[PDB]
Design an enzyme around this catalytic site. Structure first.
Site, PDB file in Angstrom:
ATOM      1  N   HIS A   4      11.192 -85.482  44.679  1.00 20.07           N
ATOM      2  CA  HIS A   4      11.027 -86.841  44.229  1.00 20.07           C
ATOM      3  C   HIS A   4       9.580 -87.165  44.591  1.00 20.07           C
ATOM      4  O   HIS A   4       9.209 -87.230  45.772  1.00 20.07           O
ATOM      5  CB  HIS A   4      12.022 -87.783  44.925  1.00 20.07           C
ATOM      6  N   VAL A  30      13.861 -91.389  56.529  1.00 17.87           N
ATOM      7  CA  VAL A  30      14.437 -90.078  56.833  1.00 17.87           C
ATOM      8  C   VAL A  30      15.451 -90.196  57.976  1.00 17.87           C
ATOM      9  O   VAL A  30      16.413 -89.426  58.068  1.00 17.87           O
ATOM     10  CB  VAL A  30      13.342 -89.055  57.181  1.00 17.87           C
ATOM     11  N   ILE A  33      18.470 -92.238  55.757  1.00 18.70           N
ATOM     12  CA  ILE A  33      19.080 -91.724  54.519  1.00 18.70           C
ATOM     13  C   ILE A  33      19.333 -90.223  54.542  1.00 18.70           C
ATOM     14  O   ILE A  33      18.406 -89.427  54.441  1.00 18.70           O
ATOM     15  CB  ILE A  33      18.211 -92.072  53.287  1.00 18.70           C
ATOM     16  N   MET A  36      17.540 -87.562  52.208  1.00 22.12           N
ATOM     17  CA  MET A  36      16.120 -87.238  52.343  1.00 22.12           C
ATOM     18  C   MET A  36      15.933 -86.057  53.284  1.00 22.12           C
ATOM     19  O   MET A  36      16.326 -86.130  54.446  1.00 22.12           O
ATOM     20  CB  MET A  36      15.335 -88.455  52.852  1.00 22.12           C
ATOM     21  N   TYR A  63      20.027 -91.084  47.443  1.00 25.17           N
ATOM     22  CA  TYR A  63      18.919 -91.825  48.050  1.00 25.17           C
ATOM     23  C   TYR A  63      18.626 -93.111  47.271  1.00 25.17           C
ATOM     24  O   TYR A  63      18.424 -94.160  47.865  1.00 25.17           O
ATOM     25  CB  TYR A  63      17.680 -90.933  48.126  1.00 25.17           C
ATOM     26  N   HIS A  66      21.101 -95.787  47.975  1.00 27.35           N
ATOM     27  CA  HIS A  66      21.402 -96.022  49.382  1.00 27.35           C
ATOM     28  C   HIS A  66      20.976 -97.452  49.785  1.00 27.35           C
ATOM     29  O   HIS A  66      19.917 -97.932  49.371  1.00 27.35           O
ATOM     30  CB  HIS A  66      20.717 -94.973  50.253  1.00 27.35           C
TER      31      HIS A  66
END
EC number: 4.4.1.26
Lengths: 92, 94
Positions: A4, A30, A33, A36, A63, A66
């Site tokens: 991404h 990070v 989530i 990630m 993600y 989220h």
């Protein structure tokens, strides 16, 4: 493993400390989530680059919706003038 | 280690055969230009359609790549393939 990648230009009014804060707080996602896997960002009218690693195209979407990511967008979307998004599988 | 990233849109007339030869030749430059340490490219699944990332040792070695005759040659031949292009050079950080 897919990427991404997004590219940003901040609005003129955003200060240097604010841009730095933006990325620090983004990178901290990070910690919240699970999808990630890694993040790196950099600065080279787009000025900034962000790359996030994902297990699959599926996990990218986890993600996206989220609650922390939605929250990040709500706080920070006002920081950028323009943004480009790319999702792809690197290959040679 | 620094990153050379570019994002492109091909002109509408460009064929799948032209596109594959384009990335095949570009990826092959690693074997010709010492400065290029690795290359990956991809097609977006979500204007711009394609992504290319090149890893370099430092900003100095990027210029060696820039004026290298094989790189200049790639540009002369293949620049007509793209409708639009964005270039970024940056050091990745956390």
């Amino acid at each position: 493993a897919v990427k991404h990648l997004f590219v940003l230009k901040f609005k003129d009014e955003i200060t240097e400390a604010q841009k730095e804060e933006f990325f620090k707080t983004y990178v901290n996602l990070v910690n919240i989530i699970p999808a990630m896997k890694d993040v790196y960002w950099g600065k080279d009218g787009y000025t900034h680059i962000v790359e996030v690693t994902f297990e699959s195209v599926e996990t990218i979407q986890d993600y996206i919706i989220h609650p922390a990511h939605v929250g990040f967008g709500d706080v920070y979307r006002s920081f950028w003038e323009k943004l480009l998004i790319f999702d792809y599988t690197p290959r040679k």
